[PDB]
């Protein structure tokens, strides 16, 4: 049971839930089709390819997929662009209110 709920918060997703946002096994070609045309706000984090270890936060905005690369800091931290946080699930929660470029993080793409 306990299926369904309401609230006055556009952003309603678990940041500490990789199985909710982390797509791990996902390539750009895919991630794109998942955030291509999708409602503005959709996002997801998959294993980066260009660089080993790094990640890529694919977001949906401007009728495109805003790929927000997440640099891997040596201090066990992540640096997304020109900002830094405690970890992956520590930056997405801080963006739930802040607008990256023209929008904010609403909810992670569907499985």
Phi then psi for residue 46, to 5 deg, are -125, 170
The number of domains in the chain is 1
Q: For position 32, which CATH number holds?
A: 3.30.505.10
Domain that holds residue 90: 1-111
């Amino acid at each position: 049971g306990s299926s369904g709920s309401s609230g006055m918060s556009s952003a309603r997703f678990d940041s500490s839930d990789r199985s909710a946002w982390y797509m791990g096994p996902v390539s750009r070609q895919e991630a794109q089709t998942r955030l291509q045309g999708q409602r503005h706000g959709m996002f997801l984090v998959r294993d980066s390819s260009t660089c080993p270890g790094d990640y890529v936060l694919s977001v949906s905005e401007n009728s495109r997929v805003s790929h927000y690369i997440i640099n891997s800091l040596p201090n066990r931290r992540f640096k997304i662009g020109d900002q830094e946080f405690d970890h992956l699930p520590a930056l997405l929660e801080f963006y739930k209110i802040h607008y990256l470029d023209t929008t904010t993080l609403i909810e992670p793409a569907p499985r």
